[PDB]
Amino acid sequence: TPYCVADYLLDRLTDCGADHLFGVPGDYNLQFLDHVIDSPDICWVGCANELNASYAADGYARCKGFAALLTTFGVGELSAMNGIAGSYAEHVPVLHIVGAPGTAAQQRGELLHHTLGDGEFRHFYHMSEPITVAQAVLTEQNACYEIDRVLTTMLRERRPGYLMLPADVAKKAATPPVNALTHKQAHADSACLKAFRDAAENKLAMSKRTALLADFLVLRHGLKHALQKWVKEVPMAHATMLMGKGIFDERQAGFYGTYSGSASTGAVKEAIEGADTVLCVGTRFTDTLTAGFTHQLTPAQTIEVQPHAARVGDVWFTGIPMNQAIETLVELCKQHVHAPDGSLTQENFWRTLQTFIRPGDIILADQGTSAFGAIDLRLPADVNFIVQPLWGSIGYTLAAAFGAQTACPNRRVIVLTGDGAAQLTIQELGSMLRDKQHPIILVLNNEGYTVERAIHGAEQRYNDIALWNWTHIPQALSLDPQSECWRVSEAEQLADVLEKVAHHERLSLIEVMLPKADIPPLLGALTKALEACNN
Amino acid sequence: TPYCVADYLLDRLTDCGADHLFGVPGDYNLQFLDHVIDSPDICWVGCANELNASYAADGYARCKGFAALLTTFGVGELSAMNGIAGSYAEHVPVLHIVGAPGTAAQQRGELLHHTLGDGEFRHFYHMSEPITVAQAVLTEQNACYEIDRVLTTMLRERRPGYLMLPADVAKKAATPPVNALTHKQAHADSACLKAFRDAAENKLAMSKRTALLADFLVLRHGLKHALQKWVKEVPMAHATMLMGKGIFDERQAGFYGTYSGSASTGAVKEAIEGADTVLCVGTRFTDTLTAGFTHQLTPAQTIEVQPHAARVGDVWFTGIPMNQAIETLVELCKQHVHAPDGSLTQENFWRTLQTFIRPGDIILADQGTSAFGAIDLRLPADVNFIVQPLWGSIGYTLAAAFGAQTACPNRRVIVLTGDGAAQLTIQELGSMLRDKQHPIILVLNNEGYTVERAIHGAEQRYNDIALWNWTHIPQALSLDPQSECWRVSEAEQLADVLEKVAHHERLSLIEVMLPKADIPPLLGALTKALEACNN
Amino acid sequence: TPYCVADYLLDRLTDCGADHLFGVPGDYNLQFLDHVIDSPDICWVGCANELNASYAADGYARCKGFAALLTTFGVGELSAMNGIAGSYAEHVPVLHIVGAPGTAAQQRGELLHHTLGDGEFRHFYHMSEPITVAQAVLTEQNACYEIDRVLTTMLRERRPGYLMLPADVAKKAATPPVNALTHKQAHADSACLKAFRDAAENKLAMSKRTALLADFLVLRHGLKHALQKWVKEVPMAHATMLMGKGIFDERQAGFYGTYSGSASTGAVKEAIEGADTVLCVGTRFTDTLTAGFTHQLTPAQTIEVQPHAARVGDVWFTGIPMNQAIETLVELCKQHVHAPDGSLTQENFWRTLQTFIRPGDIILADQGTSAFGAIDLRLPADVNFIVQPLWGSIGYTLAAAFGAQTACPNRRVIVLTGDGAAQLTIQELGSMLRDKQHPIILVLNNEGYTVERAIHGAEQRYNDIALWNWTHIPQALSLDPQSECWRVSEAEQLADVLEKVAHHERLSLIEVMLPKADIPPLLGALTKALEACNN
Ligand SMILES: Cc1ncc(C[n+]2csc(CCOP(=O)(O)OP(=O)(O)O)c2C)c(N)n1
Ligand SMILES: Cc1ncc(C[n+]2csc(CCOP(=O)(O)OP(=O)(O)O)c2C)c(N)n1
Ligand SMILES: Cc1ncc(C[n+]2csc(CCOP(=O)(O)OP(=O)(O)O)c2C)c(N)n1
Ligand SMILES: [Mg+2]
Ligand SMILES: [Mg+2]
Ligand SMILES: [Mg+2]
């Protein structure tokens, strides 16, 4: 078992923060798989299909900051396309490793299985270029430094990477790295940082009131603590949008709720849009997050910081690391200080869930009523809120949850998913069972896609779905389900079963019966804007 | 004239070693052009067409290690494609800057001139991806760090880079860099270098005789001195192939001539192929350099070092910088010490030229009899030999020469070009005149493409060319040609004209009449192999 | 000499209307070249470089409706990129044939010359995809039907096509086609044509006055006669823009001059923009043709016909061939009837040229004062006016002229080119000489790029050019120039010389001395708009 490229790769995975590898075996990656099984630092996690695997890796990365996925040439990698795309869209560092035929076989252009039958082997590699920030075809001559390059680029941009690993290359000899792959992000040019500082100061110096608006990018770049500390030391109005929900303890002073354009509550709208200068940190104003771009923030009124550039008014200062810009803003901000029960409905359902969430929780909500209902949950401290509003691929959360549980075995995972969504990735529930995870899964059963009904064709057949018997799924995907299932239809029951599971001694699945047309407050707004675009 | 992106870019150009900018103006780059003219560090050099400009930049980069080209969107950039491609093929760091329409206009998808008329503005950018190692579309939010990224990647890989500079972005405010862009190439993993060292030692330790074979990559990575020093301290048989010709003083001990497979002389073939261990440094065995892949070197018999990886036998050690690998090899080597006149013809022409070349010369030879004749020149010290065997685009050398003169005003530039080749880039001779350069240009007039004739269809009309009156060209491309012209046909004539022009007090153009079918020794071999491929 | 793929290809070329093949030889296309030389239907035309060749083919196709270009892998094809792009931008059917290495050698991924040195052979093929409507890599199994498919697609869309011809494939056996490749463009769906007809009628039925505006697409689709006949039978105000100049006899009734937005004369602006319904046929409103999009034409006021779709008001009728739409419009229209100097200057130069042009002339004008001055020429009948306003690549017209002469040996070719422009493709003048063509070439010598000066930096060094001795160029690019040359500075001299060369018994080159800042009327407008975009 001499040390080889396969081992080098795994070592770099661990250096990056990954302790598991998701994926599904395939002819071309079996031998590589031996190495991951023999590795004492990487644990193999086989999934039901590669789409789920990619979702799982995404979830995992949202917990540990990095993840890896292993698929097989063609059939495996293409099945994961939507997953990687989502990771790229929401800045989630997922490494995609694809086992491929030997270099010699590829040169020969043979009619190998898992190919288009044309002797071409770079089709899928090129198809993956738009959804990765770095990729490479590993060869006997570039193996190690290419591996280090993509991984390094991944950590810098916080996005997916792609590595084609030909089976023979995996076996090639290599020597263990003396040093772990370093992150060490470069500092900003002092002069540029100064220019930014001066511009920011002049702006904040004349500001009557200042507000802070932060989103997902701060989560991706590990600046949560920086922001919590900031708002604690310098009290001010502060919020996040759906994507960044979870960076703040929403029970603290200065938090009036989650911001989402004109669809926000009057308090939030006032606290944020009302300030004469608002700091936008790691912010991305997508249509879903702003209720159709109805946010009232102007260039003059704002200061925004992005991963590698910051802006004050109309001027941009490129070449400034997000962390340094935030640091500068904190210093300046200290320099200008200023003074019931019954039948279940979306309404009472979210109200009940509110009294249930506890610190240290990991909550995932899928597209639809789940996500736009959960947006109103007032989160305690140390809770990881996982949602995917920009990419918005339904089915994601159930699989993502499996990934989160794998990353945090000792944290309570709450999965909020619609009945339509859960159908797309149901088989991963079988993986939760196999690995004996204890997540508390709530399926909002409203007999279909109510968000779609809300947008158009409420009574159209295409918004219906096969009606499943949810509570019986666990015993179908397992020979001995360490699970507990319930069908709830009354607020009381829901609250009842919630306390019975609040300590997750087993996988618990709760089928929550809800009205077909019942829609959360926010959702109505977003829904009316979407159909307005269709007309 | 506030400091802006345009200025930031130029400053980085100078940091990289460029003092000139080649190109041809265009609507979209005029404003940017102002900045280069006002810059005290960058000199603008307008050319006759973009193709020539790109060739000139390549030649310039082969002298100063870096160059920049400026063209206009669409019509300008595509005209330079072949040049950039050649730079990429032969590892020449040329930065291609293309002035483009404003970002707003591009978003609007307007029917602007220099477009395909479809509202798309990324076609040409994408078309340039295969021939650059890094590229970027500059925006108001990424300007500076993207500019530094491509330039940095260029210096690392020694290859072309591409920057699309929208006119409005050029005008955006920026702040001067406090520090010059650093190269600082990373060191190899001590463990990997060790493994390479041990493997190399075991191999060298049992070697009866060792030989050194170096090529162009050592020139590109600035290791010319390292190799000269090496061979001086550790005497051994050593050579280069056509591409790397010039790294060694071929008058020194251990040099028996240029290596080119079985087409080499018996002495060279024995000195190199005869050693039981041959060191291949920065080597690339192309068909033209090996006479149809007729080199007799085996894996076991060799040790090769590439830019980022080295090999001994069948084992590769990836992640080792070329300079460190050479350093290691030098240490280990010291541990194993082991003791004309008459009618002109290709024959007497090259013999004459041999007595003419002097140290400090810069010699350029185009594809055809020029290049395969010049390969036998025994070069003195400090001479820059410029040839392009891998890409092999005829016309290149005349324009490249202009670039070389621009970079080395005080060095004697000898241009060896065929009559067919000179026709493709003739107008750049007008630039030489305008800038009052004093090249000594020799046009081998054999009435056509004799190399092609040698390959196939010797008496075919397609190998003929319009017959020009070469000695009258200067007075056609200038109102006051600071030049001297000669039509030579006897070795004595050539001999005398060369003594006259020895100190290049003026541009001198020598039309050398040669036989239509006269071919140099080496060329016959290469020629027979090429047609063998056609059958 | 058994019939092979090479022969099949040539036969298809002739079927398409080509009698010549432009290009420059190369190792990989020599054997194919034998076939073209032996062909009694295709004449080989070797050029100075492949950029010029592609321009020549473009010009040729503008005369015969189809052309072919032959280059060599990598170095050849990339040099022609700008030409093919221009052809694609302006809808010129040029077939680009590139000779390539044998299929076996390509599969092997060898380090062949003219490659990037990575074993990849599809880079350039892919790079050419955005500028062609069809392309194919010829193989032993697809040769003939792929050849027919791209050619057919070319004829349909009137755009460039690409064929990679591996040397070995060219030698493969084939059988001569029984039938010539048919065009036979499909008819429109009767119901769709009816809907278009009814909509057009309702519009025309209430029109007080109707005007016709036609451009280059009618030229490309061979509908010149259809339009001339139209306007003759149904008298009405009619014009073309710069690109379509030449479709009409501008001396006839109803023609008030060339249309170009607000930069047009009051008469033209009134005749066209003044009608309540204007027919836009084969029209493309680019920025250069409309003086910065200053045309005053509204959707309700217009009816436009494109190659495969027509529009009336806001409704589009897709699936209607241009020729049928025109036919329908003609029928409906018939249903609604209604009631000297001394010192030379741009002014007196164009006035003089006006009295010189005669029916049957072929006039080419390059970008700059040439094109924007020639736009005011009142053209007689049967004159082919060649200009390239959309792509706008300078240097194009000199080479294109060579192509036009080749296609029309017995027509008088007038080349109007600036001194800046002619420098980029000057060597093709050598080809005109070699083939003994009798162009009458006028070089507007105003010491530089006056259009650029008019746009920005009038006194900037970057708008200057090497000053050439134009009248001495022919005797430099030929050993026996069958030509006459004159430097002209007075209007008297211009008229005189023009009378001497009227019957083009020889190549005649006229250097026309003009003021550095002298700009034509129209150009001032276009110039002010371009710099407005830079700010
Ligand atoms: C992969 C994928 N396919 C289709 C869609 C379109 N879509 C968005 S929401 C939705 C339905 C949501 O159904 P569900 O989970 O039932 O939500 P609820 O009725 O709870 O709102 C669909 C089909 C999507 N986002 N992703
Ligand atoms: C741009 C380009 N076009 C075509 C070729 C194919 N080619 C290789 S050598 C050659 C002719 C060389 O002519 P010349 O300079 O006359 O040389 P000689 O007769 O001295 O061998 C040609 C056309 C090429 N290398 N590059
Ligand atoms: C290949 C190419 N390079 C650069 C340009 C930008 N350009 C447009 S017009 C022009 C100068 C025109 O010079 P010239 O032929 O002298 O005309 P005049 O002075 O008659 O206007 C230039 C450089 C272009 N259109 N095409
Ligand atoms: Mg549902
Ligand atoms: Mg020659
Ligand atoms: Mg001019």
CSV table of N, CA and C in Angstrom, one decimal, chain C residues 199-265:
chain,number,residue,atom,x,y,z
C,199,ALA,N,-52.4,41.4,-42.4
C,199,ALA,CA,-51.9,42.4,-41.5
C,199,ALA,C,-51.3,43.6,-42.3
C,200,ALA,N,-50.5,43.2,-43.3
C,200,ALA,CA,-49.8,44.2,-44.1
C,200,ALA,C,-50.8,45.0,-44.9
C,201,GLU,N,-51.8,44.4,-45.5
C,201,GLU,CA,-52.8,45.1,-46.3
C,201,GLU,C,-53.6,46.1,-45.4
C,202,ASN,N,-54.1,45.7,-44.3
C,202,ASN,CA,-54.8,46.6,-43.4
C,202,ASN,C,-53.9,47.9,-43.1
C,203,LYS,N,-52.6,47.7,-43.0
C,203,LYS,CA,-51.7,48.7,-42.7
C,203,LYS,C,-51.5,49.6,-43.9
C,204,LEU,N,-51.2,49.0,-45.0
C,204,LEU,CA,-51.0,49.8,-46.3
C,204,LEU,C,-52.3,50.4,-46.8
C,205,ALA,N,-53.4,49.8,-46.5
C,205,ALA,CA,-54.7,50.3,-47.0
C,205,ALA,C,-55.1,51.7,-46.4
C,206,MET,N,-54.5,52.0,-45.2
C,206,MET,CA,-54.8,53.3,-44.6
C,206,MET,C,-53.6,54.2,-44.6
C,207,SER,N,-52.6,53.8,-45.4
C,207,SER,CA,-51.4,54.6,-45.5
C,207,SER,C,-51.5,55.8,-46.5
C,208,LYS,N,-51.2,57.0,-46.1
C,208,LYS,CA,-51.3,58.1,-47.0
C,208,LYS,C,-50.1,58.0,-48.0
C,209,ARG,N,-48.9,57.8,-47.5
C,209,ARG,CA,-47.8,57.6,-48.3
C,209,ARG,C,-46.9,56.5,-47.8
C,210,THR,N,-46.3,55.7,-48.7
C,210,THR,CA,-45.4,54.6,-48.3
C,210,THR,C,-44.0,54.8,-48.9
C,211,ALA,N,-43.0,54.4,-48.1
C,211,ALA,CA,-41.7,54.5,-48.5
C,211,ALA,C,-41.0,53.1,-48.3
C,212,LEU,N,-39.9,52.9,-49.1
C,212,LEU,CA,-39.2,51.6,-49.1
C,212,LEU,C,-37.7,51.9,-48.6
C,213,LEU,N,-37.3,51.1,-47.6
C,213,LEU,CA,-36.0,51.2,-47.1
C,213,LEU,C,-35.4,49.8,-47.1
C,214,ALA,N,-34.4,49.6,-48.0
C,214,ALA,CA,-33.8,48.3,-48.2
C,214,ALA,C,-32.3,48.2,-47.9
C,215,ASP,N,-31.8,47.1,-47.4
C,215,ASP,CA,-30.3,47.0,-47.1
C,215,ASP,C,-29.7,45.7,-47.5
C,216,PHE,N,-28.3,45.6,-47.2
C,216,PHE,CA,-27.5,44.5,-47.5
C,216,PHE,C,-28.1,43.0,-47.6
C,217,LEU,N,-29.1,42.7,-46.7
C,217,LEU,CA,-29.6,41.4,-46.7
C,217,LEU,C,-30.3,41.0,-48.1
C,218,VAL,N,-30.8,42.0,-48.8
C,218,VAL,CA,-31.5,41.7,-50.0
C,218,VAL,C,-30.4,41.4,-51.0
C,219,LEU,N,-29.2,42.0,-50.9
C,219,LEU,CA,-28.1,41.7,-51.8
C,219,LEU,C,-27.6,40.3,-51.6
C,220,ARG,N,-27.5,39.9,-50.3
C,220,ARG,CA,-27.0,38.6,-49.9
C,220,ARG,C,-28.0,37.5,-50.4
C,221,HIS,N,-29.3,37.8,-50.3
C,221,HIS,CA,-30.3,36.8,-50.8
C,221,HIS,C,-30.7,36.9,-52.2
C,222,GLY,N,-29.9,37.5,-53.0
C,222,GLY,CA,-30.1,37.7,-54.5
C,222,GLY,C,-31.5,38.2,-54.8
C,223,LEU,N,-31.9,39.3,-54.1
C,223,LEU,CA,-33.2,39.9,-54.4
C,223,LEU,C,-33.1,41.3,-55.0
C,224,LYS,N,-31.9,41.6,-55.5
C,224,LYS,CA,-31.6,42.9,-56.0
C,224,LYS,C,-32.6,43.3,-57.1
C,225,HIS,N,-32.7,42.4,-58.1
C,225,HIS,CA,-33.6,42.6,-59.2
C,225,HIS,C,-35.1,42.7,-58.8
C,226,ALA,N,-35.5,41.9,-57.8
C,226,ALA,CA,-36.8,42.0,-57.3
C,226,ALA,C,-37.2,43.4,-56.8
C,227,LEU,N,-36.2,44.0,-56.1
C,227,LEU,CA,-36.5,45.3,-55.5
C,227,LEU,C,-36.4,46.4,-56.6
C,228,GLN,N,-35.5,46.3,-57.5
C,228,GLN,CA,-35.4,47.3,-58.6
C,228,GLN,C,-36.7,47.3,-59.4
C,229,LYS,N,-37.2,46.1,-59.7
C,229,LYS,CA,-38.4,45.9,-60.4
C,229,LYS,C,-39.5,46.5,-59.6
C,230,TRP,N,-39.6,46.2,-58.3
C,230,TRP,CA,-40.6,46.7,-57.4
C,230,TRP,C,-40.7,48.2,-57.5
C,231,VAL,N,-39.7,48.9,-57.2
C,231,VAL,CA,-39.7,50.3,-57.2
C,231,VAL,C,-40.0,50.9,-58.6
C,232,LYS,N,-39.7,50.2,-59.6
C,232,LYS,CA,-39.9,50.6,-61.0
C,232,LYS,C,-41.4,50.6,-61.3
C,233,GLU,N,-42.0,49.5,-60.9
C,233,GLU,CA,-43.5,49.3,-61.2
C,233,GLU,C,-44.3,50.1,-60.2
C,234,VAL,N,-43.9,50.2,-59.0
C,234,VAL,CA,-44.6,51.0,-58.0
C,234,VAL,C,-43.8,52.2,-57.5
C,235,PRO,N,-43.8,53.3,-58.2
C,235,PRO,CA,-43.0,54.5,-57.8
C,235,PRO,C,-43.3,54.9,-56.4
C,236,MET,N,-42.3,55.1,-55.6
C,236,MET,CA,-42.4,55.6,-54.3
C,236,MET,C,-41.0,56.0,-53.8
C,237,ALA,N,-41.0,56.7,-52.6
C,237,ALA,CA,-39.8,57.1,-52.0
C,237,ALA,C,-39.0,55.9,-51.6
C,238,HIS,N,-37.8,55.8,-52.0
C,238,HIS,CA,-37.0,54.6,-51.6
C,238,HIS,C,-35.5,54.9,-51.4
C,239,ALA,N,-34.9,54.2,-50.4
C,239,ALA,CA,-33.5,54.4,-50.1
C,239,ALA,C,-32.9,53.1,-49.5
C,240,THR,N,-31.6,53.2,-49.3
C,240,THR,CA,-30.9,52.1,-48.6
C,240,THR,C,-30.0,52.8,-47.7
C,241,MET,N,-29.3,52.0,-46.8
C,241,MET,CA,-28.4,52.6,-45.9
C,241,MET,C,-27.0,52.3,-46.4
C,242,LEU,N,-26.0,52.7,-45.8
C,242,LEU,CA,-24.6,52.5,-46.3
C,242,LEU,C,-24.4,51.0,-46.7
C,243,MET,N,-24.7,50.1,-45.9
C,243,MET,CA,-24.5,48.7,-46.3
C,243,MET,C,-25.2,48.2,-47.6
C,244,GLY,N,-26.4,48.6,-47.8
C,244,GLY,CA,-27.1,48.1,-49.0
C,244,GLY,C,-26.9,49.0,-50.2
C,245,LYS,N,-26.1,50.1,-50.1
C,245,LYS,CA,-25.9,51.0,-51.2
C,245,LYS,C,-25.5,50.1,-52.4
C,246,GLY,N,-26.2,50.4,-53.5
C,246,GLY,CA,-25.9,49.6,-54.7
C,246,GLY,C,-27.1,48.8,-55.3
C,247,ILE,N,-28.1,48.6,-54.5
C,247,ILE,CA,-29.2,47.8,-54.9
C,247,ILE,C,-30.1,48.6,-55.9
C,248,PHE,N,-30.1,49.9,-55.7
C,248,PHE,CA,-30.9,50.8,-56.6
C,248,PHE,C,-30.1,51.6,-57.5
C,249,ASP,N,-30.7,51.9,-58.7
C,249,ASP,CA,-30.1,53.0,-59.5
C,249,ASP,C,-30.5,54.3,-59.0
C,250,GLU,N,-29.6,54.9,-58.3
C,250,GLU,CA,-29.9,56.2,-57.6
C,250,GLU,C,-30.1,57.4,-58.4
C,251,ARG,N,-30.1,57.2,-59.8
C,251,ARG,CA,-30.4,58.3,-60.7
C,251,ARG,C,-31.9,58.3,-61.0
C,252,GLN,N,-32.6,57.3,-60.6
C,252,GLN,CA,-34.0,57.1,-60.9
C,252,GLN,C,-34.9,57.9,-60.0
C,253,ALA,N,-36.2,58.0,-60.4
C,253,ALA,CA,-37.2,58.8,-59.7
C,253,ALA,C,-37.6,58.1,-58.3
C,254,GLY,N,-37.6,58.9,-57.3
C,254,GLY,CA,-38.0,58.4,-56.0
C,254,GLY,C,-36.8,58.2,-55.0
C,255,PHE,N,-35.6,58.4,-55.6
C,255,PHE,CA,-34.4,58.2,-54.8
C,255,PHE,C,-33.9,59.6,-54.5
C,256,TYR,N,-33.8,59.9,-53.2
C,256,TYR,CA,-33.3,61.3,-52.8
C,256,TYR,C,-31.9,61.2,-52.1
C,257,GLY,N,-31.4,60.0,-52.0
C,257,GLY,CA,-30.1,59.9,-51.3
C,257,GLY,C,-30.1,58.7,-50.3
C,258,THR,N,-28.9,58.4,-49.8
C,258,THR,CA,-28.7,57.3,-48.8
C,258,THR,C,-29.2,57.7,-47.4
C,259,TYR,N,-29.9,56.8,-46.8
C,259,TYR,CA,-30.5,57.1,-45.5
C,259,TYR,C,-29.5,56.7,-44.4
C,260,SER,N,-29.4,57.6,-43.4
C,260,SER,CA,-28.5,57.3,-42.2
C,260,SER,C,-29.0,58.1,-41.0
C,261,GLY,N,-30.2,57.9,-40.6
C,261,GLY,CA,-30.7,58.5,-39.4
C,261,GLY,C,-30.8,60.0,-39.5
C,262,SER,N,-30.7,60.7,-38.4
C,262,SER,CA,-30.8,62.2,-38.4
C,262,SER,C,-29.6,62.8,-39.2
C,263,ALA,N,-28.6,62.0,-39.5
C,263,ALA,CA,-27.5,62.6,-40.2
C,263,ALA,C,-27.8,62.6,-41.7
C,264,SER,N,-29.0,62.2,-42.1
C,264,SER,CA,-29.4,62.2,-43.5
C,264,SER,C,-29.7,63.6,-43.9
C,265,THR,N,-29.9,63.9,-45.2
C,265,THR,CA,-30.3,65.2,-45.6
C,265,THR,C,-31.7,65.4,-45.3
